[PDB]
Nucleic acid binder design. Structure first.
Ligand code: MG
Ligand code: MG
Ligand code: MG
Ligand code: MG
Ligand code: MG
Lengths: 772, 773
DNA sequence: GAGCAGCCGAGCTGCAGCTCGGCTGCTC
DNA sequence: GAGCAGCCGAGCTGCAGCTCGGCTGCTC
DNA sequence: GAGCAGCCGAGCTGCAGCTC
DNA sequence: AGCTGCAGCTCGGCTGCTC
């Protein structure tokens, strides 16, 4: 058998076939690592190619459960032709018309078992290994029972001590993350994440293959397996919506001891832990958070952009910026996916996902006609922080107070941003995930400004009304779909908004001219869909696309005497006319307002109001958290600057005899009443909590006097320093002035920043989001 | 016509066929940009549209048709007939290979009026890709060039924007810009942009480029010189390229540049002499290494970027991340995928690998000898890490401040070349082609190099005086033998060539020949497949089984019954190749092509490994002088600065400085008291300053070295720290003058000291499989 | 009788698959 | 009048291919 | 609203700290 | 000499004023 990317065991299919293992790795790179370990005469029987074969799974394998129908059980033509699954069936000699119930039939296979060597990320052991188990369970459940399906367990994270040869190994990112927060310090630790099998170094691969047999686990079937395979991989997404609303239930210590002592894993437990953990992670990766409308990748890209560009906004190529984001924000996935999200994050065309892109795209970033799929490759085009928009919408002062994600024991991106405006309902989104779909249509900016200002401005005439409405979850002000960059019409019919294109009829020339398409409808795909209809093309002799870069003009030349037959074979409803029916110039803005909670998990909203009402408390509270901490540091900075002024007012006074070292100089300052200060924390509070700031700022030392430069002893410098103190005490009164406000602390500065975000949006809109 | 990556003009092939343009872009990204400009109702009729413009992709470098023809008539090699890119161009245009297109009627049977090459402005685009396109038409339809059927669209490569001026300055060659930047006082108020592809232009620039589309379309013309020039640059004889690429490109005269621009016509012969030659020269500098450090431009960027990236923390980083760092900070103007491959190749360490002393530590699966390093993981799995102990000893950091540097986009990039402690060009394995020249080297034995270099440097060694007496007369006294590291076989010299041999063992009973070593740089899997491809050799073989370890060889060749006697007969036993070493092709020849790149540019043909080492010695000898001479200058100045500081704090309480109001008044009194005006940043951080610039600028004066003094410097322990610092400085300074006065030349003793340091690192790397754990 | 392939550094690009639900074609 | 596949998006898993250039090897 | 200037803020080198 | 985690230094960016 000569299957692609297959390297046989020497004894495969022979007399000793049932002694052979078929190793199934994720791809070529993992395969090359397995070959590295399978070819040692220094392991002195580890395995070798005498009895071990290799085969590539080609990434995620096809879900056979959704591609079969039982009359018998027939495999649909996509599943029958899958090159990856064909190669496994051929290499193993599997038979689809055999149940493999008897020991004699099982010995007609070309290998004794198949050992899944998937990577240890949730994608590997949860989804890919899950999908592989569902394949065998669907067609040969007997093979699972008799241990024909095994797996190789490898670590996902290794943590090495500086003074220890052997490391501590983890198999789930949760295992590490909990163990790391409960660690006193990781300065003497380097965390390594193994994104694929090919990531282990030579000494680790030798260790992994010396102990190869003690790390092969065998899968078993119970009664719960059959339903669980249907919940996780069946046709009914409702069953996933029920299962994926709760967290993973961990294994009991009695359970983990049985599994490891006999090295057998029931399929049902694998589905409840590994596969479920992936699908939960998959939701957090693809469905955005309702607070800031971002996914994990897009939040990493923004946090990485702020670090990369807020100090120096020189443009950078996309693949370079992707490297920065992946480095500094600890991105554990493929470089090419992250580069696509960067490009899509910066596209600004009529109907694009983002009405307010986080970056300025410099180069060819895609047109409306091809759904932004005609953007240049990541090596030609560059991005640049839309700084004026970003600084007004994501206040830098607030990022210190957000909860943060920690990857590999180090701080990464925020768990969520809390922007000044409800970004989750101000943009276009549409993509699926596990269990839930996600689709949202951007609300009108003026409707959003009206809602938030009523909530915040005490002088608004609907302020008290809105608060009484939020409490009972009623609606008083409209939240209409946005019409910006849309020349068509929006109409409401009952509970649904509809988007309409625009057309012109010239009865003489017999041309229908489409001058706008429905919302988010790409031009080239639209024209191709009207040629794929035999019904409609009977009346069309030609379609010609004269559209601008970003305006629509399609010339539909009709066949002689068809306009009268069109009105007949296409009905005219009170909500759509016959030509709008003929040319499919109307869609429905169906929403799937499923989002991600701050502390994890899905959340099903019922209206755009509910999202806005849920986001308000987080933005309200952050303005308080911000002002409360600016108060704490200002209090502290005045203490530090007044202490410095009093020192240099007494400089020649305290230095009255020569002192030996820096610890003696601290004797003199302590006895004279100068406070020991942690100047590093007072100048740079960073992520310190107020309770931690007060605790640690005053337990310090006196570097703030000893690092003082002689030039700060000058009179002109001193008056500069003392007027700085006036600045801070005027500010501190203003700060606690703002804390005392109605309806809540910081209401007036929230209003100030809403005007700043509006001004930035207007400037960007007037410049096609270029800001030049 | 349904061709891949083709978008027709609406009038193509119709009544108005000859009114249509076929725009030929490099690829999809460039194609999508042209579609952006061809679809404006805000520009035009001033600009073109899809009414009369079509587009098609050239798919990067196009096939060189000149090397795929033979004259029987002229037959096209069957690989050239099946080239999908050139097939599609002929289809779209309706071109006929049996048609001369001499008359206006024949040319009107084509489906377009002309073809406009819209290539990028890098030398790859206009020099290579556009050159090969012109050579294609010149080879088959030269009449089409004469009648102006082959045109091109000129776009800028570099744009410089001023922070007051709205209109930028545009350049069409990187050299024209580079000169314009050296003649500028400062470009601090300028943003330079390099446009590696068409898709790099922004929306406002593409709009500007499309009003003046017709004013930027140039037409090609044929001369009498064209025929010979097309053969020199694209013909079958590489000898003609070796002749042409020995000189720089001779620029166009102002008379030539004015005629070309006034009529928008470009002679083919002139384009080949300027654009294509400029590429082929750049291609040589990119792929042929410099003989001083054995590196190419990409690998030097990768090392220079590695030092910057890793000097803060040698924490490993994934390859694609490090590649992004290098491309950003070292100004890499090329594809992301190429740079990522060169990073991987720079870190491979297996028997027969290119590098015996890699600059990085590969962490993960980086490839085996069995697959020629082609089984390395993708750049997203594997990580790199500076081989710091090797790098610090081989490329001394003090020297990098004193090397010449290349400046890209007006900013300092990687060094022009490194000058390593040992002649790296002859210590590693290389083999790849370029334009005009091939490159192949086989690593010399490290011990022979250490023996030769130490003799040159060590005054107290037999025989220092002998070797120098030999270099003058161009003799060779000590051997430079091929390296044996990671090689189980034997090396033999026969005439002008060394040969490497594999090893085999015969078990007459079991009838198995077991190959236990292969020739140098021979990958295992490809070797086995070549003897599976021979019917001559497989007549005697019943099976081949590979039991080889990771990096030791064990191939079991089981023979057919009674063939061992037919082997010794049906092959040959030479005094140089045993029948079985012949039967199993266990011998290669160490063909060398010691072609390199000179400092400050150009190729150079060496004839032996000694000459390369002899050429490298003066650069390393002199650099040790430049190094010590500048450390002397900086030591003198730092001593002046620290003694002035000591005197200040000894007089601090006397001339107390809280006494005066302003900062410039405090410097007046300090001036009046004799304290010297010092440019403290330059004495503390000289960086890339030459001594002549150091001496000129050191006394520019500031007195910040006193005003920035922290209160802690008034402490007893701090001042005593200063005088022990001053002592150590004066000492070092005395030691420096000893090293400057040394024989045979300045710094001989530290060169020998550093040769020991690099050796210890090489030994350490070898003892740890270049992992250093 | 050329052609195929190998290297490095470059110029361009291309697929398989998962998830969900609305629509539209198709099919029976 | 009622069944399937097909498509699509984001974010993921995993890969593939055509060229130039110089010389030497191999088979053919 | 755009120059001009001064000061702020954190990204990312510098320089102790602990070696070996 | 020689990392490398901290702290601290730098300068492009803001922020104020003025024209
Ligand atoms: Mg993986
Ligand atoms: Mg995580
Ligand atoms: Mg005093
Ligand atoms: Mg190009
Ligand atoms: Mg350059």
């Amino acid at each position: 058998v000569d299957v692609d990317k297959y390297t046989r065991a020497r004894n495969a299919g022979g007399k000793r076939a049932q002694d052979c293992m078929l190793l199934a790795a994720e791809g070529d790179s993992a395969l090359s690592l397995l070959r590295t370990g399978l070819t040692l005469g220094k392991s002195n029987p580890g395995p070798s190619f005498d009895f071990c074969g290799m085969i590539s799974l080609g990434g995620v394998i096809m879900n056979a459960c959704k591609k079969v129908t039982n009359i018998i059980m027939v495999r649909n033509e996509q599943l029958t032709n899958n090159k990856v699954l064909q190669g496994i069936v051929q290499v193993l000699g599997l038979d689809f018309n055999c149940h493999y119930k008897t020991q004699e039939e099982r010995a007609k296979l070309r290998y004794g078992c198949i050992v899944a060597c998937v990577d240890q990320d949730l994608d590997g052991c949860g989804k890919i290994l899950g999908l592989l188990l569902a394949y065998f369970h669907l067609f040969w459940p007997q093979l699972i029972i008799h241990g024909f399906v095994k797996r190789l367990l490898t670590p996902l994270i290794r943590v090495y001590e500086k003074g220890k040869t052997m490391p501590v190994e983890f198999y789930y990112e949760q295992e590490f993350d909990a163990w790391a927060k409960k660690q006193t310090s990781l300065v003497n630790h380097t965390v390594k994440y193994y994104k694929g099998l090919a990531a282990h170094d030579t000494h680790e691969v030798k260790s992994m293959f010396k102990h190869f047999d003690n790390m092969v686990y065998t899968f078993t079937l119970d009664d719960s397996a059959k339903e669980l395979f249907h919940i996780y991989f069946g046709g009914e997404s409702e069953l996933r919506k029920r299962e994926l609303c709760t967290g993973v239930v961990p294994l009991t210590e009695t359970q983990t001891q049985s599994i490891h002592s006999v090295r057998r894993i029931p399929c049902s437990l694998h589905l409840q832990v590994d596969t479920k953990a992936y699908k939960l992670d998959a939701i957090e990766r693809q469905i955005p958070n309702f607070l800031d409308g971002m996914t994990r990748a897009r939040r990493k890209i923004l946090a990485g952009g702020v670090k990369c560009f807020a100090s120096n906004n020189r443009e950078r190529k996309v693949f370079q910026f992707g490297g920065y984001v992946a480095d500094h924000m600890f991105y554990h996935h493929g470089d090419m996916s992250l580069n696509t999200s960067i490009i899509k994050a910066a596209q600004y065309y009529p109907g694009s996902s983002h009405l307010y892109p986080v970056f300025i795209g410099i180069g060819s970033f895609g047109s409306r006609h091809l759904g932004g799929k005609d953007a240049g490759s990541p090596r030609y085009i560059s991005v640049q922080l839309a700084s004026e928009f970003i600084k007004t919408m994501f206040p830098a002062e607030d990022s210190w107070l957000l909860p943060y994600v920690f990857e590999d024991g180090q701080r990464a991106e925020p768990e969520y941003y809390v922007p000044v405006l409800p970004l989750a309902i101000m943009e276009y989104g549409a993509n699926p995930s596990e269990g839930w779909k996600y689709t949202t249509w951007a609300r009108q900016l003026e409707d959003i400004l009206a809602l938030v200002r009523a909530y915040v401005d005490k002088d608004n005439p609907k302020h008290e009304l809105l608060h009484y409405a939020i409490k009972h979850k009623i609606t008083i002000l409209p939240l209409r779909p946005s019409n910006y960059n849309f020349k068509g019409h929006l109409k409401r019919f009952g509970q649904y908004y509809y988007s309409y294109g625009t057309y012109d009829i010239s009865e003489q020339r017999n041309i229908i001219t489409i001058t706008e398409l429905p919302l988010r409808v790409p031009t080239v795909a639209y024209i191709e869909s009207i040629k794929k209809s035999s019904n409609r093309m009977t009346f069309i002799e030609e379609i010609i696309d004269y559209s601008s870069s970003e305006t629509i003009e399609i010339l539909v030349k009709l066949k002689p005497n068809s306009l009268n037959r069109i009105v007949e074979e296409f009905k005219e409803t009170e909500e759509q006319d016959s030509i709008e029916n003929f040319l499919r110039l109307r869609n429905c803005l169906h929403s799937h307002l499923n989002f991600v909670k701050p502390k994890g998990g899905i959340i099903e909203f019922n209206s755009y109001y509910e999202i806005l009402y849920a986001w308000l408390p987080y933005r309200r509270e952050l303005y308080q958290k911000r002002l409360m901490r600016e108060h704490a540091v200002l209090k502290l900075r005045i203490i530090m600057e007044t202490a410095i002024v009093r020192y240099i007012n007494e400089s020649a006074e305290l230095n009255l005899s020569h002192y030996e070292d820096e610890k003696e100089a601290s004797r003199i300052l302590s006895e004279h009443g100068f406070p020991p200060l942690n100047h590093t924390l007072i100048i740079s509070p960073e992520f310190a909590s107020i309770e931690e700031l007060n605790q640690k700022a005053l337990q310090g030392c006196y570097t703030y006097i000893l690092s003082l430069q002689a030039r700060e002893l000058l009179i002109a410098a001193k008056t500069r320093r003392v007027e700085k103190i006036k600045k801070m005490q005027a500010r501190l009164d203003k700060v606690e002035q703002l804390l005392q406000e109605s309806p809540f602390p910081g209401a007036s500065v929230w209003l100030e920043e809403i005007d700043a975000v509006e001004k930035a949006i207007i400037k960007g809109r007037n410049t096609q989001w270029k800001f030049h």
